[PDB]
Amino acid sequence: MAVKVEYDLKRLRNIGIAAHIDAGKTTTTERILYYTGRIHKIGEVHEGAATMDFMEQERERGITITAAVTTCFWKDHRINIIDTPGHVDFTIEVERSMRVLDGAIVVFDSSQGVEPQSETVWRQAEKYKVPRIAFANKMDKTGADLWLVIRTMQERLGARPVVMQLPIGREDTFSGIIDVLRMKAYTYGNDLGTDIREIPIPEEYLDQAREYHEKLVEVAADFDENIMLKYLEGEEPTEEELVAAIRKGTIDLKITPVFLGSALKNKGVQLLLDAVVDYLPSPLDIPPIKGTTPEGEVVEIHPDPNGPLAALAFKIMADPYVGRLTFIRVYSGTLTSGSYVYNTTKGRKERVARLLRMHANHREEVEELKAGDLGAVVGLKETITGDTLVGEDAPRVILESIEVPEPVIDVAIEPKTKADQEKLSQALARLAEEDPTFRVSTHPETGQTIISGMGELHLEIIVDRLKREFKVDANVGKPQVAYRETITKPVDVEGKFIRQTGGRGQYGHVKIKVEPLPRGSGFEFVNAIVGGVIPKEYIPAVQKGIEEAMQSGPLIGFPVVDIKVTLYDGSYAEVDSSEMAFKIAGSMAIKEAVQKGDPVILEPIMRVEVTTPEEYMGDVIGDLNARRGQILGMEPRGNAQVIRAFVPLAEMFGYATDLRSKTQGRGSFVMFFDHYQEVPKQVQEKLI
């Protein structure tokens, strides 16, 4: 539609943002919305629920978060800010977004470049197959070298930037834009110097431009055989042919545009918005597509709001103004205001008062929400994230199959006055819905939490969250190891218990041989007996006394596993003997035999296979030996070299920053616990 009900979505521009600053997204976004919408409110600097600790990091390294939805109009071209604000750690919503969006957009202040985190956002952009651009804004601000960013693209992805412009001046001197294919420039006036005068290209950029009209016809021939065939023929194709090809090519992600300039003093900006429309599409410029039913039919999701509804619920806040804003994305179908609207994976209609699209710090109210669209509901004052919704009219599609952040920094946690535990299970209950950047698990002995999460940065963001919202006090324990205890040498003992209680004497005597035994036996009892002496009558108790002194091991008192017990001798006489006496007598016997049979505690032993360069072996080898590594071989993976090793759990627990530092030369790694092995003995003895 070219009528509103659909048209805001039918001209929409799904952009997914990574940015640095100075220009960047957050430094730029409000007054550049002033330069075409003549208003605007962003709200990311700096927003809770967490961030006032790691706000400075957020800005450089992804960009600032909380601005995610925006609609604005250039000449009925609805020009849009859409999800993925900046986060590189929190990438459930990035995975959701790359399947949704069309433009993955890197913003610079022109002296910035491609970071680790930029590389990560390209891999995520890659995974769900988006077109992308870069724009070097603030070319009139120092350090501004376009060609390293071109160079780095050529280098880093091995691949094709495409030069969209030449500038006139650079870092310290920018003042005009050269179109390199139409071979002409435009210069930009004042403080508000969107004042354009179409000047020539000066000689100094003519040749790179000419190469580039040539490269831009070249590039155009790459998406339309008529332009190649005319190029081939001896025509050079014409602008319009090229304009039509570039759209084809861009939506097929066959290019990566690199732009420059400086929108800072308004310069040219309104006219640029027309190139957005030209080469990128709407989310309604795709058809009905498939998700699979609960009975296993592939099933039509409709990019066509007229069709079957399909929705994901992704973001819950509580509010004073509605009480509760519940943010939802519709994938297909039309959800209308003033109604009760359907959740399939709950099974119910809940009551919509108003339908809104929620921006950073503010609402805009709407009649309806459609196939590809997002917004916030008024009404529904308990409805939750993480259900899958399809309509009353729909087949029951799959919309969601996204992969989650995953850990590399482990923390055991303990609240301390128990009042901080009280407002901790509240704080944990909140963080548990909200945070896919950790993994939680319960030591249930204590009832304590052992978190693993998603990086130093993730743990910073937690910390950040803690200082703001939680108001909780806690002692964070170590990343820590599990045990077993065991005998190593066999030793041969006796147990006696002869004392009076209950009128008469109580008398237990047993003679055991206690041995090391292989695993998954647990206990093993051999009765050399042949009844009497250490008699059969008293055995289940006499075995019971061993069974309970297995549970306390003889080092720090952790369970002692797999030992072979041969019961051979003893004595008894009932008027003075008892089976419990015999139990206690058996109980006594063992502790000494296992102790003199040289016991040890066992710590969980990991097997690790690590992809590295092979002379990066001499980078890694001192860390690996400190980390107690024992090489099992060196095997290439992909292309690059996987060193195998066996490692006891306890030394790895610092790593995560150094970890992104260790993930070199087509880097990767796997890890599993395999078996227990013994804890360094001198240290071991200290724990007791």
Swiss-Prot record:
Query: What is the superkingdom listed in this entry's lineage?
Result: Bacteria
Keyword Protein biosynthesis assigned: yes
Kindly give the SUPFAM superfamilies that the UniProt entry links to this protein.
EF-G C-terminal domain-like, P-loop containing nucleoside triphosphate hydrolases, Ribosomal protein S5 domain 2-like, Translation proteins
Tell me, what is an example of a GO biological process annotation in this record?
Answer: ribosome disassembly
The residues that hold GTP are 19-26, 83-87, 137-140
Family designation: Belongs to the TRAFAC class translation factor GTPase superfamily. Classic translation factor GTPase family. EF-G/EF-2 subfamily.
Q: Could you tell me what this protein is called?
A: Elongation factor G
Source species, please? Thermus thermophilus
The upper taxonomy is: Bacteria, Thermotogati, Deinococcota, Deinococci, Thermales
